[PDB]
Chain A
Amino acid sequence: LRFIMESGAKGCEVVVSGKLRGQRAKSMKFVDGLMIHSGDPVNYYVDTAVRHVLLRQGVLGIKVKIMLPWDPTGKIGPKKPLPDHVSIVEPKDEILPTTPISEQK
């Protein structure tokens, strides 16, 4: 999880399910950061993988989800931003005193 987040991810989640010692099967889930679950943006913003680890007592499933950071160009993450995020361009700066006196060379 720490490596995922220093790699730049917007959030991550690792769930480990199976025999965590004992007869019964436990499932732990460590989610750090932010991640969506619903809608279309999960297809291009959340990348997930499921693996099976064969131990001497049984099979342990590891499910890892990483929510990619928004990135225009470069293809490290997704191009289009989250559809609910509205970005505002800052209007041009205006710092003028009472009397317009400009600095010229």
Chain B
Amino acid sequence: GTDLVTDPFEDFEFNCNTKYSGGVTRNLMRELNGG
């Protein structure tokens, strides 16, 4: 079987209030400005 992939955007929208809020926030920030 396979697994669906997640954009940092939807990841943040789903885990904004969870144990993984810090990680999703950091990954979203890395997406938006990571150069």
Q: Which residues of A contact B (CB under 8 A)?
A: 20-22, 26, 28, 54-57, 60
| Contact indicator A55/B3 (Cβ below 8 Å) | yes
User: In the complex, how many angstroms separate the beta carbon of A57 from the nearest chain B beta carbon?
Assistant: 6
Majority secondary structure, A binding face: loop
Task: Name the contact of B14 in the complex, choosing from A26, A54, A56, A57 (C-beta under 8 A).
Answer: A26
| Contact indicator B14/A55 (Cβ below 8 Å) | no
| Contact indicator A60/B4 (Cβ below 8 Å) | yes
CB within 8 Å for A55 and B6 given contacts A20-B14, A21-B11, A22-B14: no
| Contact indicator A21/B2 (Cβ below 8 Å) | no
Contacting residues, chain A, for B2 (C-beta < 8 A):
55-56
